Amino acid sequence: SIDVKYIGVKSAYVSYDVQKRTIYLNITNTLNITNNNYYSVEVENITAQVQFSKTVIGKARLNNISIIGPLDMKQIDYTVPTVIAEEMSYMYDFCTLISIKVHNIVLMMQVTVTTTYFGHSEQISQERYQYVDCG
Amino acid sequence: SIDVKYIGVKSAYVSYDVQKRTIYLNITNTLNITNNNYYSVEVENITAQVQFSKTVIGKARLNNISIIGPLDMKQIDYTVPTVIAEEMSYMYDFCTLISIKVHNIVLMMQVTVTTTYFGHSEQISQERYQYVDCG
Amino acid sequence: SIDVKYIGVKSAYVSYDVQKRTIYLNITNTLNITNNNYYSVEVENITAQVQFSKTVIGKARLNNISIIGPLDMKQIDYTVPTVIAEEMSYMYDFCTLISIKVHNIVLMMQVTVTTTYFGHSEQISQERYQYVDCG
Amino acid sequence: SIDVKYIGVKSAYVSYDVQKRTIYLNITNTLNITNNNYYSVEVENITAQVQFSKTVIGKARLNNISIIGPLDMKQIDYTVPTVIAEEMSYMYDFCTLISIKVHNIVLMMQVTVTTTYFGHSEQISQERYQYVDCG
């Protein structure tokens, strides 16, 4: 990649910016520029490419074969009980969380058994997060 | 990629911006520019490409074969009980969450058993999040 | 990559920026520039590439074969009980979290059994986080 | 890579920036520049590449074979009980966390049984974090 970037607040080529109780006074702001940006990306002069697969079987005898590809989950539990047995009793609760198997961002590519692959591949995930907030 | 970017508030080529109790006064803001941006991306001079697959079988004998591709889930549980047995009793609750298997963003590409692939592939996920907020 | 960068607040080519109780006064700000940026990335002069696979079987005898690819999960538990047996009793709670198997960001690429691969591959994850906040 | 960098607050080519109770007064700020940046990255003059695999089997006899690829999890537990048996009793709680198997950022590439690979591969993870905050 080129230029992959995370600005928390503010960004610029230039900024004469100001704020609050500012007496920006009697000013000469000049700005001659000559910004000239060129890009030549993933450029391919190829005269012969091939992606050949060949699967020859003859007089063979094949039993109890299992190709499992990735991320086989199996026989999973999440047992999560709660009880509140009150008697002559005050309860207050607040911001009271029972998170179980939360996801947010789940990106996959070329999750395979096989691949003949040829080229650019990419993954990008700029962000802000906050799971919980209270007062 | 080129130029993949996350601005929290504000962004610009230029910004003479101002705020609040600002006496921006008696000013000369000039700005000569010559911004010249060129892009030449994923450009392909190819004289011969091939993606060949061939599957020859003869006098073979094949039993109990299982190709499972990825993400086989199997036999999963999420048991999540709650009880509130009150007697002569005040309960207050607030912001009281029982999240179970929440997702947000789920992007997939080339989730296969096989692939002969040729070219650019890409994935991008700019964001803000907040699961919970209270007061 | 080129240029992969995380700015907490603010960023620029230039910044004459100011703030609060600022008497920026009687000023001459000039700025001659000649910013000239060139990029020539992932550029490929190839005269012959091949990705050849060949799978010859004859008079063979094959039993109880299992190709598992990665991330096979199996037979997993998460037992998480809670009890609150109150009598003549005040309870206060706040910001009271029972997180179990939370994720945020989950990016995969070429998670395979096999791959003949040819080219650029990339992964990028700029961010801010905060799991919990309270007062 | 080139240029991979983490700025906590603010960044620039130049910054005449100012703050608070500033009397920036009677000033001449000039700035002649000639910033000229060139990049020539992952550039490949190749006249013959090959990625050849060949799998010849004859009159062989194969039993009880198991290729497991990486990250095989198996038979895992997380038993996490809590009890609160109050009688004639005040409880206060705050910011009271029972984190179990939280992740944040999980990036994988070429997690395989095999790979014939040819090229650039990359991974980058600029960030701020804070698990917990309270007062």
Residue numbers in the entry:
A (entry chain A), B (entry chain E), C (entry chain C), D (entry chain G): 120 to 254
What do the authors of the reporting publication say about this deposited model?
pmcAmyotrophic lateral sclerosis/parkinsonism-dementia complex (ALS/PDC or lytico-bodig) is a fatal disease found in the Chamorro population of Guam (1–4), some families on the Kii peninsula of Japan, and the Auyu and Jakai people of New Guinea. Abundant filamentous amyloid inclusions that are made of all six brain tau isoforms are characteristic of ALS/PDC. We now show that tau filaments from Guam and Kii ALS/PDC adopt the CTE fold in brain and spinal cord. The greater heterogeneity of amyloid filaments, when compared to CTE and SSPE, probably reflects the fact that ALS/PDC is a multiple proteinopathy based on neuropathology, as suggested for cases from the Kii peninsula.
In addition to tau filaments, we also observed singlets and doublets of transmembrane protein 106B (TMEM106B) filaments (fold I) in the frontal cortex from cases 1 and 2, and TMEM106B singlets (fold I) in the spinal cord from case 2. Senile plaques have been described in around 60% of cases of Guam ALS/PDC and assembly of Aβ is believed to be part of the disease process. Alternatively, these changes may be age-related. This was probably also the reason for the presence of TMEM106B filaments in two cases from Guam and one case from the Kii peninsula.
